[PDB]
């Protein structure tokens with residue numbers, strides 16, 4: 001298992017997870033707060 | 041030499057038989073790292089003990105509903121309690137995470153630092169929160185009858201019973217959810233229907249589990 | 254001859270089973286039973302199997318699907334029959350009488366093939382050419398004879 | 404005349420995640436790790452160039468077949 | 471292939487005789503595709519698995535060949551009611567071909583029992599091939615005493631699988647293994663015959679025999695191409 | 698040197714003729730564990746002795762009261778005049794209390810042999826209990842055990858094993874034909890060919906359930922017979 005979790009820590013895999021998470025957060029915010037153009 | 045989940049296959053190296061309920065079952069090597077295994081041992085015990093409470097609670101109330109004492113089904117109890125007693129759902133939910141948050145966080149930091157909760161910081165209590173083993177608190181509060189402070193051989197037997205009954209309860213709770221989804225009825229409505237006609241009322245004839253049938 | 258979402262869905266499941274099998278074969282033939290160099294160098298045997306087996310049997314099998322499924326279903330579709338009233342493909346396979354209605358030569362079974370009376374199958378093995386005037390595509394009876402000949 | 408027959412080797416390569424955690428393992432040049440960003444591009448350009456990783460034709464063929 | 475008994479069958483080749491030395495039961499030197507050559511063997515194409523699999527197919531086929539025709543024969547003799555006198559392919563194994571309603575449960579209820587029963591029987595048998603003698607070690611309600619095997623997966627023997635300890639001598643046991651394999655190969659071909667004849671004719675194996683005897687010239691495969 | 702269950706078989710290494718009625722028969726090797734053999738020998742005696750009472754009860758009752766079907770004698774309305782329509786719950790209360798006592802007394806003897814030989818109220822009364830399962834003393838008032846005990850034990854187990862098979866024959870015959878053992882025998886003799894198992898095996902004459910003073914008791918045949 002140590003080696004497999006080491007593989008999951010490589011740059012492409014971390015980038016995939018982090019950007020999947022970051023994209024999910026941005027998509028879900030726009031799902032619940034649609035069409036935001038200004039801060040009120 | 042000890043019995044294993046798949047007779048003939050040697051147990052994996054990291055399952056040496058010391059833990060309760062050790063049958064060499066870890067085909068995905070999820071607990072290979074010793075520090076991960078300690079965390080998972082406690083996770084299995086917390087899951088098992090919650091499942092045992094849930095299975096017994098579901099079974100008892102289902103019996104009461106079956107014999108017409110007025111209890112709701114487990115999948116309807118939540119709505120009936122709040123509406124009948126005029127309880128704010130969000131307020132009850134917040135109180136639950138306060139009380140569970142306090143107990144869980146103290147358990148969390150005893151795993152990270154064993155015996156750290158016994159320094160007297162919580163209201164002056166010292167021994168009751170020292171802990172005995174990973175996942176086995178012990179002491180006067182968690183073991184008031186001291187069944188872990190008597191016969192060592194008896195204590196090990198109880199550990200084997202606890203985890204096995206715990207695993208069975210976890211499976212049973214999975215059954216309650218699957219059976220409610222398939223049949224839409226309560227656990228003892230399902231049991232009563234099966235007993236009336238075992239050959240023709242089972243998962244193979246419920247119209248869901250075997251779609252091709 | 255696909256007419257329902259169920260038939261499409263079942264093919265998708267089978268594709269995943271094949272996908273798993275391909276990935277298993279790749280692991281198996283590299284980590285477990287890896288061929289030796291002499292196995293790869295049997296170019297004569299490889300060509301025999303890829304010509305007769307991969308292409309020959311593949312074409313024969315597909316011709317089998319066309320004769321027993323594609324042609325009957327597309328014949329009824331081009332006649333205005335509603336897709337849900339068309340017999341399911343296995344009913345065509347198991348009931349020679351239904352096929353004999355669409356193609357009378359089916360009433361004679363496979364005997365004309367074995368007696369070299371191949372002209373009997375002219376009702377579903379054709380040489381029309383051109384295009385089907387209803388659908389604008391090739392006659393499926395032509396493609397079926399094509400794949401038999403191939 | 405050589406007989407046409409099935410011929411394999413049993414268990415040639417152990418199934419393990421050890422090399423997944425060692426980028427560039429397949430090549431003698433890259434297996435030592437990066438010192439410049441050119442290493443990163445070289446890792447991907449050479450990944451499937453099997454014959455540049457070894458001269459054994461049998462080893463190349465097995466990689467081709469499973470790929 | 472040469473039927474009957476012979477020193478070597480038709481398909482025997484000088485190449486096959488290099489490794490087919492006659493030790494295995496039923497070794498008539500017939501391996502034209504050379505699937506039993508030990509050199510550079512692996513996977514499931516190896517002498518042990520292939521010989522084990524042939525016996526397994528032989529034993530299932532012998533049950534199937536007798537079981538796929540028994541209801542028709544006993545039904546003809548009147549020993550069983552006509553309601554259970556059914557063709558092997560109409561018993562519910564292939565519902566599109568016909569099914570029998572009258573079992574104590576629907577075939578999918580029965581099938582689940584088959585899965586659980588066969589998983590235990592089959593996976594335990596597998597472990598004796600992978601780890602010889604391992605099924606006699608772990609507790610199995612005291613039944614592990616009869617699952618020790620003998621070191622040869624195809625012939626476990628023991629107090630149950632060899633109930634009457636037949637073939638006590640090596641010569642006798644060798645003779646019996648030959649008889650088991652030849653009856654098994656005959657049964658395997660019979661099952662293939664049942665399947666092809668069902669598709670070709672749509673009738674049961676017993677009807678096909680009765681009709682061929684009634685008029686052999688007008689009832690055979692050649693006349694069954696047409697209708 | 699004793700005769701075994703079959704010719705040419707070899708007795709298990711743990712069956713040396715010490716026990717009465719030892720034919721070296723253990724196909725499933727259930728007795729290989731020495732602790733299990735002692736327990737299984739006790740249960741064999743219980744089945745043997747209860748079965749012999751069962752056969753004698755069915756046979757004697759059928760002769761004395763031919764009009765009563767032993768299979769249905771358990772219904773309260775069929776009880777003799779003094780006990781007719783007795784509360785079955787109160788009747789079960791006596792049996793549970795009294796059988797629990799004697800069975801736990803017998804059970805504790807297995808757990809710790811020789812520990813419950815003495816009367817618990819009137820001290821001084823004891824049973825010899827020479828062997829487990831053979832109390833003696835008050836249980837052998839006529840003193841037959843003071844002789845060739847081993848021969849008698851052989852006779853007991855031989856007749857007991859025969860009675861076990863005999864009683865299950867009564868049960869299956871009752872389910873298939875709905876007649877008692879002697880009534881079934883008379884039916885066979887009158888029409889040996891028209892009345893036998895070949896025709897009756899397909900019929901199960903037991904209802905699906907019966908009502909006993911307001912409690913519905915499920916019933917079942919031993920096979921999926923046609924109701």
Ligand code: CLA
Pocket residue numbers: 276277278279280283284416417418419420422423429465466467469470
């Ligand atoms: C879980 C099983 C498993 C494990 C643990 C291993 C382990 C190993 N294999 Mg084996 N292998 C497996 C399965 C496995 N293999 C399978 C299923 C196949 C068939 C394809 C093979 C075929 C194979 C070959 C041919 C070779 C190995 C080799 C290796 C070694 C290096 C692996 C490596 O660096 O991977 C890291 C690589 C990756 C993560 C790339 C994954 C590529 C796959 C096909 C998915 C790509 C999909 C993706 C969507 C493509 C488009 C991307 C786009 C969307 C951006 C190592 C001992 C190599 C070696 O040196 O052995 C001695 C070698 O030459 N393996």
Ligand code: CLA
Pocket residue numbers: 313314316317318320321345346347348349352358359361362363366374401563661662663664665666669670
């Ligand atoms: C690969 C292609 C292919 C396939 C699979 C089929 C298949 C079929 N064709 Mg078609 N056909 C094809 C190509 C094909 N055809 C071509 C190219 C032509 C043009 C010349 C035709 C022309 C044609 C005609 C004119 C007719 C058919 C018919 C049939 C059906 C009956 C055949 C028959 O009598 O078999 C005879 C016997 C066999 C094929 C042997 C079967 C052997 C079985 C599977 C053995 C099983 C053994 C095993 C041990 C069993 C275990 C059981 C288990 C439960 C234990 C069948 C569905 C007939 C029909 O009724 O169609 C609806 C029919 O009339 N075909």
Ligand code: CLA
Pocket residue numbers: 274275277278281282286288409410411511512513514515
């Ligand atoms: C390009 C494809 C390909 C090729 C060339 C090979 C080649 C080889 N494989 Mg591999 N294999 C493949 C794909 C392939 N495999 C796939 C997809 C899988 C996953 C299921 C496997 C799983 C596999 C295993 C588990 C084994 C091999 C073995 C072998 C060797 C002997 C094969 C043999 O005896 O075949 C002759 C064929 C048979 C003995 C009977 C196969 C019967 C199949 C299952 C049914 C018919 C399939 C047919 C093409 C389509 C039927 C359609 C319809 C009528 C139903 C050989 C090196 C063996 C080995 O390593 O030997 C040393 C071995 O043990 N292969």
Ligand code: CLA
Pocket residue numbers: 533534536537538540541544550553554555556561570
């Ligand atoms: C592996 C081979 C095989 C398989 C899968 C089948 C399958 C089938 N056979 Mg076939 N059969 C076979 C071999 C096989 N047969 C053989 C070799 C013969 C010749 C002897 C027959 C003769 C035969 C006949 C005559 C009939 C079938 C029928 C059937 C069907 C119903 C089965 C049934 O009701 O079982 C019932 C279940 C059992 C017999 C097993 C009993 C299981 C219980 C739980 C055991 C209890 C044990 C207990 C200790 C009591 C022991 C008492 C004893 C000592 C007296 C089914 C399709 C029937 C059919 O086609 O109906 C339409 C039918 O009439 N078969």
Ligand code: CLA
Pocket residue numbers: 549550551553554572894895896897898899900920921922923
């Ligand atoms: C392989 C054996 C086999 C199997 C699987 C079946 C299966 C079935 N039989 Mg059939 N049957 C068989 C043999 C078998 N039968 C034989 C040999 C006879 C003649 C004695 C009969 C007589 C018979 C009748 C009269 C009826 C059935 C019926 C049935 C159904 C079950 C319900 C029932 O009443 O069973 C009863 C049958 C048995 C308990 C026979 C058990 C046979 C065992 C498993 C095999 C060994 C028998 C052994 C050689 C001793 C035979 C007797 C002896 C005196 C020679 C089912 C389809 C019933 C049905 O649905 O009819 C429409 C039904 O009415 N069977």
Ligand SMILES: CC(/C=C/C=C(C)/C=C/[C@@]12O[C@]1(C)C[C@@H](O)CC2(C)C)=C\C=C\C=C(C)\C=C\C=C(C)\C=C\[C@@]12O[C@]1(C)C[C@@H](O)CC2(C)C
Pocket residue numbers: 722723724725726727743744745747748750751752753754755767768770771861862864865
């Ligand atoms: C106890 C018994 C019967 C008891 C009957 C009684 C009290 C009946 C009472 C009544 O009837 C009356 C008087 C009058 C009725 O109005 C009322 C009732 C109440 C109905 C039968 C046991 C019957 C028991 C039987 C038949 C057991 C058979 C066991 C066999 C054959 C085992 C074989 C093997 O186990 C070996 C030995 C070794 C292994 O290696 C291999 C295998 C094959 C597994």
Ligand SMILES: CC1=C[C@H](O)CC(C)(C)[C@H]1/C=C/C(C)=C/C=C/C(C)=C/C=C/C=C(C)/C=C/C=C(C)/C=C/C1=C(C)C[C@H](O)CC1(C)C
Pocket residue numbers: 500501502503504505527530531533534535536537538557558559561563658659661662
């Ligand atoms: C040798 C050699 C050599 C070289 O080298 C190569 C080659 C040539 C390739 C080879 C060959 C081979 C072959 C020929 C084979 C064959 C096989 C078979 C036929 C099988 C069967 C097989 C078969 C089988 C198993 C079968 C089985 C069956 C069964 C169980 C059945 C059952 C049943 C019954 C009773 C009845 C009911 O109602 C139904 C059922 C359910 C159905």
